[PDB]
Amino acid sequence: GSHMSEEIKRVIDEVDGIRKGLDRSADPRDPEFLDGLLKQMEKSPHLREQPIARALMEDLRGFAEEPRLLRTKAHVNTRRDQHIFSYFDASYFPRLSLDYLTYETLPTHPLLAERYASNTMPVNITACSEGFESRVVVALFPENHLDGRQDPDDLIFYFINKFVERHNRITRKMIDAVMAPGSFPLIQGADDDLVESASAWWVRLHEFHHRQGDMPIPDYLHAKKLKPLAGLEELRVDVSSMLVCLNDDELPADEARRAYEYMLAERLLRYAVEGIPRPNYDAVASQLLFNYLSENGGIALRGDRIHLAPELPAVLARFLDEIVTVERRIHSESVADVKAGLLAFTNAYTDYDDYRHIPFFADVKQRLG
Ligand SMILES: [Fe+2]
């Protein structure tokens, strides 16, 4: 390798060595645990030279008095370099602990980050410790750090290489075997660099739209924690994103179009089949959108193929309007009552027993891998 790449491998091999011996049953905030971790790190000769590791080490040393990873997050948020290293404690990323990555940025069109700014970093992982190999760890959020905090400057990271992989492994196959021929002309058989860019558009518009509307997630997180409502919210921001891709004609047309089709294929196909024995919240949301589209003339089933209707962009805007109409009630009714209204919308387009994978996708999951 190059000289840097060899040194990074030495840094990461040290991380992987400490990490695998850590008592993971312990409370990772316990001072004896952290002191012992600090001592292994202080005797870790390539790791302890890295600026991010020195920030982490000082944060950890002071953690009892100051339970913030203040220097670690300042390093990452200012992007002093493209190294991300910390001690993570995330319920839904259980394999993350003492973990280290380097990333490469992805170029995005200026009007995208200009008109639709958030603190979102779509990046590719270029090297990492074992925790970041977990296929589950497709993003990284400020509160996943040991201090559990999210603050207004914090950058959110999405590992686009992992989304491209999911597209290559599941979505492509599904487009061919599930959609009508000709459904997704700009993204069908598209090159990975083009999927990559579509996916970076998706995450950027996704996070932007979370913060938009009458019930934006920062403020209304708890209103939207129930599985159907968590899923309906993700649907709201993805459809909003799709519609920006169709309606904002100042965006480059091929890229916006490619992003649009990527988002719709991912939502209609890959997210719709996820689920151990039963659908997850993303799956239920895809079920919801699918049923809603069937029943309102956005898509039709014939031949065991989804056919995308000419007026799908109109049915999408109708869909988003029904959510916004319910969410606008927040300004005059109780949260409990607006939550009941959101729930009533989802129940009209899903099947609950937990939720059941709808029969069309039960057969696709059966038919395909
Ligand atoms: Fe989201």
Q: What letter represents residue 173's amino acid? A: K
Between helices 312-327 and 335-347, what is the axis angle to 10°? 150
- Contact at 8 Å (CB) between 18 and 41? yes
Buried b (16+ CB within 10 A) or exposed e, 151-177: eeebbbbbbbbbbbebbeebbbebbee
What would the 3-class secondary structure string for the chain be?
CCHHHHHHHHHHHHHHHHHHCCCCCCCCCCHHHHHHHHHHHHCCCCHHHCHHHHHHHHHHHCCCCCCCCHHHHHHHHCCCCCEEEEEECCCCCCCCCEEEEEEEECCCCHHHHHHCCCCEEEEEEEEECHHHHCCCCCEECHHHECCCCCCCCCCEEEEHHHHHHHHHHHHHHHHHHHECCCCCCCCCCCCHHHHHHHHHHHHHHHHHHHCCCCCCHHHHCHHHCCHHHHHHHHHHHHHHHHHHHHHCCCCCHHHHHHHHHHHHHHHHHHHHHCCCCCCCHHHHHHHHHHHHHHHCCCEEECCCCEEECCCHHHHHHHHHHHHHHHHHHHHCCCHHHHHHHHHHHHHCCCCECCECCCHHHHHHHHHCC
Pairwise CA distance, residues 10 & 253, whole Å: 44
Nearest to 285 by CA among 341, 215, 237: 237
Contact 101, 78 (CB under 8 A): no
Q: How many CB atoms lie within 10 A of CB 212?
A: 13
The experimental method, as deposited, was X-ray
14 Cα to the center of ligand 1, angstroms: 34
Instruction: Report the alpha-carbon distance of residue 264 to residue 242 in Å, rounded.
Output: 7
Tell me, in angstroms, the distance from the centre of ligand 1 to residue 33's CA: 33
**Å from CA of 346 to ligand 1 middle:** 17
In order of 136, 183, 209, 311, 313, the CA distances from 297 in angstroms are: 35, 16, 25, 8, 11
Cα separation, 107 vs 109, whole angstroms? 7
Q: Which residues contact 315 (CB under 8 A, 6 or more apart)?
A: 293, 296, 297, 298, 309
Residue in the structure block whose two tokens are 């995208």: 112
Cα 81 from Cα 155, distance rounded (Å): 14
Residue 47 C-alpha to ligand 1 middle, in angstroms?
33
**CA of 211 relative to ligand 1 center, distance in Å:** 10
Distance 188 CA to ligand 1 centre (A): 25
Q: Would you call 303 exposed, middle or buried from its count of C-beta atoms within 10 A (0-12, 13-18, 19+)?
A: exposed
Residue 71: what residue type?
R
Cβ partners under 8 Å of residue 363, min gap 6: 304
Q: 210 C-alpha to center of ligand 1: Å? A: 7
Task: Count CA within 13 A, CB hemisphere, residue 59.
Answer: 22
First-residue to last-residue Cα distance in the chain: 37
Within its chain, how far is the Cα of 40 from the centroid? 33
Burial class (CB in 10 A: 0-12, 13-18, 19+), 351: middle
328 C-alpha to ligand 1 centroid (Å): 20
Residues 292, 323 contacting (CB under 8 angstroms):
no
C-alpha–C-alpha distance, residues 251 and 236, integer Å: 21
Locus of tokens 């840097």:
4
352, 276 in Cβ contact below 8 A?
no
What CA–CA distances, in Å, run from 118 to 18, 79, 204, 212, 340? 35, 15, 7, 11, 30
Q: How far is the CA of 230 from the centre of ligand 1 (A)?
A: 9
